Design a protein around this nucleic acid. Structure first.
Lengths: 258, 144, 184, 60, 134
RNA sequence: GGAUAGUGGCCUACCAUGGUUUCAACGGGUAACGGGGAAUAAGGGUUCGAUUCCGGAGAGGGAGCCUGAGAAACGGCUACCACAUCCAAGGAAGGCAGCAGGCGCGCAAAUUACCCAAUCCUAAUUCAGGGAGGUAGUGACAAUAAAUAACGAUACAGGGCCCAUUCGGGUCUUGUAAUUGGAAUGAGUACAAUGUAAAUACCUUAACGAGGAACAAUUGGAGGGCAAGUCUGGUGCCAGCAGCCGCGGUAAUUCCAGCUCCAAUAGCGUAUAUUAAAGUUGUUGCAGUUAAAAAGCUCGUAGUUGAACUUUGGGCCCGGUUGGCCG
RNA sequence: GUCUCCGUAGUGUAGCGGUUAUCACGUUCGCCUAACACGCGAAAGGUCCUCGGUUCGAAACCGGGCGGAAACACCA
């Protein structure tokens, strides 16, 4: 409507943000950044409703202005910064490093990683092209541009970005027998192994990912994220590791815990 | 075959034949043709104010004997001459010429209720005060 | 532009409102259980219809059905929790065989009578509304509470009530002050 | 066929009727107590049964 | 006032904001409520701090009486309290004074009137005074 | 080939005469923004959907344009038409279908209040601004819970049963009372605390706060469907009552008042529109001899429907689900 | 608000400062049946809108008020 829109009512916000429907009629619309607004998490909601460190909106602003959090090495100062998958927030105070990894249920998590793990970030490349001056480059899922990559690196693989130096240190090829991470869709947050794939040269490539419990599901190739080989994950997996128990098994788990 | 098509690919014929056959319904024709917005004196409204032009008296229909003590009121919006009916006993004394009366339906969806011929509306409020209140002596009619 | 709140009607008026047989039935039930409005009977019947409809939809599905099993035990567990269904009747068929009297018996008004602290259901109602009776450590003034076989042992006089010790009360003080001053 | 019939008889019986005032009576209980009074009268203390129960009998 | 028994729950630590948050559970048997200054006073020594270092809000008395649930905060330093505690709670206890900036209506009218003049207006004021002197 | 940020009759020059249509084009009406959804019901379905969310159009009716990434912007300009304001008659300033409020319209719809304290947005930016928004006020649009009363003792009236010592007491009862008594909180006051940007409310709780004359609950009906009078007084085809049948012409169980009773209950009635009722829209699931309904008859397209048949049968095994001796 | 045209039984509505009556409808009354009905045979129905004067004497001569029937006005 005569230009862009800078607003988000508290009814069209993504449901994985776990926002209520009574505290105000608006939602914290993420600013333009590395990830899409529907596939990321603003810093305000993460610190106010997930970690409960801040209560009000100004408390998040005061914390952010005080140069405390560090997202992907950068301190950042925007309350609506779109932190999505494979985003590490480092806090000099409280001695905690937080990593944004999806859960089995379909939301984000508060997974805590060691300082060594926060030094590296996995990234799924999207485009490989020969740019100006003949220099090759890759386009990771976060939008980072890395020049002069490994020639073996192609589309639909994952690279290990050094974050601190912004250099590729390890690449994982996409083939059968690779542990992946589903990002997006009704089957998001599942972790499994690839057995085969039907190419379907018309768009929307499909891959048959199989869970460790012999459960198999179909997810489009655009929603996959290889996170290592079979049995060895290059990243510390979240609790549960995407078992995806049914409603019956979950109820017995609760009754075995209370 | 019960006189109707019964093929798995014959749905237009049933749909069309349904469209023409539902026109025989009184309610279907009354709603879609929109005669309530054209010929209905109220113009698709539950109530209508007007001006009391004169006091009227009509006789009952067969097997009955009474004067219904009606009234002729001109609606404001439409400007049509419409007869009304003052319901309760001793209620014409409250009403008078050049008065604002809030008309209403009579319960037959347009038709005449009983022995009253032609009259299809009843007076509910006069001069801003309800007829029932004055009849029960709960309120008094404003003078001017 | 805030999200609107959700509201629902919890009672269903009878299709035949004018019938002597049904009219006397609810009058007997209301008087026996101490109910003022027959909408209370309309409400409790509405809840019975909903659970019966939900249970009926479950009984048209085959055994070992994840949807039928999960919701079936959840509804059964809730019913046996609230005390309308006995432990040996947890088979999803007696759920359709529940009546209004069974639900009415679980109301806190009837439980107060049953434990013997009101001597009359109408006296239970005034005790309910006058805050002389509490559940656990919380004062409840709603006649319809539906105790669930676990708080039934916690039904007792509230600590902040003249009947259960505490400060003697309002009209007692006026009478006590009047006689003390008369005798002084 | 006439439409200007005499209207001087309007409110006739409304005037010739005598005037009677409602004498005060003991207050009937309202609410749950009325339902209790109905219960104690409908079933507990039913008096006139004849062959079928009667709610409001007249002078017999 | 009697047997207050201030019991704290869900205590957390924020070096980010230099404060500790906790949902304070207070029981007031046979007494109506506990005043805000009351809980703040004994909040000082349980956390080994001063009176002018704590913050409590909420305290919605539980129905029936005898219990109240509220949420409380404790700040390490006075200057940290100034720079983090919002102004409305600061003026509330004793921490600052709320100056009346007239109201919203007159401020809006004054802003529009100041918008109608292009400049400081000293030359405009002297020009209109000279022209309209007679 | 021009123009566009781009493909394109978007436009231009030339050439060909094509493109859509009974499979419902085109034209007309729309008490037509569309959808997510709402009411209603066993199922099927019908009706509605301006209205909190998403996608669109407009700033009184049209046209044109600057700036800017983004407008064909109207709380930005330019012109015309219909409106309309200030004039010391030359001239100048406007578009509330933004927040309040005013006139008119009508059956029909609120304060010319407070705050950026929350949910967010914008700027150079933590600080500032936002009738976006939130709070309060009016508010019986709709929903939830729920006061108006209960409990003892006396005067009668009972239900099993004890004495079978007469019709004596009746021990336990359930109500009727020109019987009388104790305890009980709520509505309303609110010291105070909490609430909240300041507050107003909710909750808390000092203290003050019923004995009925009291702190008073109404809305309809009592011939039938459709539960509740062969009661009293008045009226006498008059007044009037009734959604349907009908009642009233001097014996009114239907009118107008009183008594009594019943229906719902802080709710009830009425009018209009709609749904179930309606198997009276019938795909599920109508009827066509006589109640309305086989075209006079035949040919015949679109449409609908359309004979049978083409790989069976027989074994050999394996691993899963449901229960199963033995638990 | 200021100014102008009318006001007359129940409906109609005449008619005319020494004095308000008529006319049809109607309104009742004796008439018949059982209630009728038509058929009929008779008589009940106006402070002349209100007030005040002019007035021997007025409703009408005049003026004030109201009602209705028509106008123009009416930015704390």
């Amino acid at each position: 409507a005569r230009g862009p829109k800078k607003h988000l009512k508290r009814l069209a916000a993504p449901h994985h943000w776990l926002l209520d429907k009574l505290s105000g009629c608006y939602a914290p619309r993420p600013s333009a950044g590395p990830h899409k607004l529907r596939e990321s998490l603003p810093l305000i909601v993460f610190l106010r409703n997930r970690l409960k460190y801040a209560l009000n909106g100004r408390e998040v602003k005061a914390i952010l202005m005080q140069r405390h959090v560090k997202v992907d090495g950068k301190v950042r100062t925007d309350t609506t910064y779109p932190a999505g998958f494979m985003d590490v927030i480092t806090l000099d105070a409280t001695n905690e490093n937080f990593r944004l990894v999806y859960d089995v249920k379909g939301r984000f998590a508060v997974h805590r990683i060691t300082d060594e793990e926060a030094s590296y970030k996995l990234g799924k490349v999207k485009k490989v092209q020969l740019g100006k001056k003949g220099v090759p480059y890759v386009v990771t899922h976060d939008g980072r541009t890395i020049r002069y990559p490994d020639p073996n690196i192609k589309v639909n693989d994952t690279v290990k970005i050094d974050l601190a130096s912004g250099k590729i240190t390890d690449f994982i090829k996409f083939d059968a027998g690779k542990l992946v991470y589903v990002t997006g869709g009704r089957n998001l947050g599942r972790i499994g192994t690839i057995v085969h794939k039907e190419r379907h040269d018309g768009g929307f490539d499909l891959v048959h990912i199989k869970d460790s419990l012999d459960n198999t599901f179909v997810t489009r190739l655009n929603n996959v994220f290889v996170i290592g080989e079979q049995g060895k994950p290059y990243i510390s997996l979240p609790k549960g590791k995407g078992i995806k128990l049914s409603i019956a098994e979950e109820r017995d788990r609760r009754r075995a815990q209370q | 075959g019960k006189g109707k098509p019964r093929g798995l690919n014959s749905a237009r014929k049933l749909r069309v034949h349904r469209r023409n056959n539902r026109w025989a319904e009184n309610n279907y024709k009354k709603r879609l043709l929109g005669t309530a917005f054209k010929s209905s004196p109220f113009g698709g409204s539950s109530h209508a104010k007007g001006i009391v032009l004169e006091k009227l008296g009509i006789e009952s229909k067969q097997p009955n004997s009474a004067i219904r003590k009606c009234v002729r009121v001109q609606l404001i919006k439409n400007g049509k001459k419409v007869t009304a009916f003052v319901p309760n006993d001793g209620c014409l004394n409250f009403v008078d010429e050049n008065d604002e009366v809030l008309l209403a339906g009579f319960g037959r969806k347009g038709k005449a209720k009983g022995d009253i011929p032609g009259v299809r509306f009843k007076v509910v409020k006069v001069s801003g005060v309800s007829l029932l209140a004055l009849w029960k002596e709960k309120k008094e009619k404003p003078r001017s | 532009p805030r999200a609107p709140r959700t509201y629902s009607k919890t009672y269903s008026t009878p299709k035949r409102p004018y019938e002597s047989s049904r009219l006397d039935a609810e009058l007997k039930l209301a008087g026996e259980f101490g109910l003022k409005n027959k909408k209370e009977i309309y409400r409790i019947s509405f809840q019975l219809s909903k659970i019966r409809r939900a249970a009926r939809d479950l009984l048209t599905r085959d055994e070992k059905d994840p949807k039928r099993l999960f919701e079936g035990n959840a509804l059964i567990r809730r019913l046996v929790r609230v005390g309308v269904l006995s432990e040996d009747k947890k088979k999803l068929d007696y759920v359709l065989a529940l009546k209004v009297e069974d639900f009415l018996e679980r109301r806190l008004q009837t439980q107060v009578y049953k434990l013997g602290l009101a001597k009359s259901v109408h006296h239970a109602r005034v005790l309910i509304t006058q805050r002389h009776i509490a559940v656990g450590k919380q004062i409840v003034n709603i006649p319809s509470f539906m105790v669930r076989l676990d708080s039934e042992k916690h039904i007792d006089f509230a600590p902040t009530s003249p009947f259960g010790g505490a400060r003697p009360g309002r009209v007692a003080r006026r009478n006590a002050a009047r006689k003390a001053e008369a005798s002084g | 066929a006439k439409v200007h019939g005499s209207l001087a008889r309007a409110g006739k019986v409304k005037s010739q009727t005598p005037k009677v005032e409602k004498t005060e009576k003991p207050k009937k209980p309202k609410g749950r107590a009325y339902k209790r009074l109905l219960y104690t009268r409908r079933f507990v203390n039913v008096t006139l049964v004849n062959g079928k129960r009667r709610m409001n009998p007249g002078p017999s | 006032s009697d047997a207050v028994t201030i019991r704290t729950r869900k205590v957390i630590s924020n070096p980010l904001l230099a404060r500790k948050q906790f949902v304070v559970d207070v029981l007031h048997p046979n007494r109506a409520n506990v005043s805000k200054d009351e809980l703040r006073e004994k909040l000082a020594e349980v956390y080994k701090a001063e009176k002018d270092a704590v913050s409590v809000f909420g305290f919605r008395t539980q129905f029936g009486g005898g219990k109240s649930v509220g949420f409380g905060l404790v700040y390490n330093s006075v200057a940290e309290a100034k720079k983090f505690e919002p102004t409305y709670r600061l003026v509330r206890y004793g921490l600052a004074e709320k100056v009346e900036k007239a109201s919203r209506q007159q401020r809006k009218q004054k802003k529009n009137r100041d918008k109608k003049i292009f400049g400081t207006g000293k030359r405009l004021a002297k020009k209109v005074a000279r022209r309209n002197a007679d």
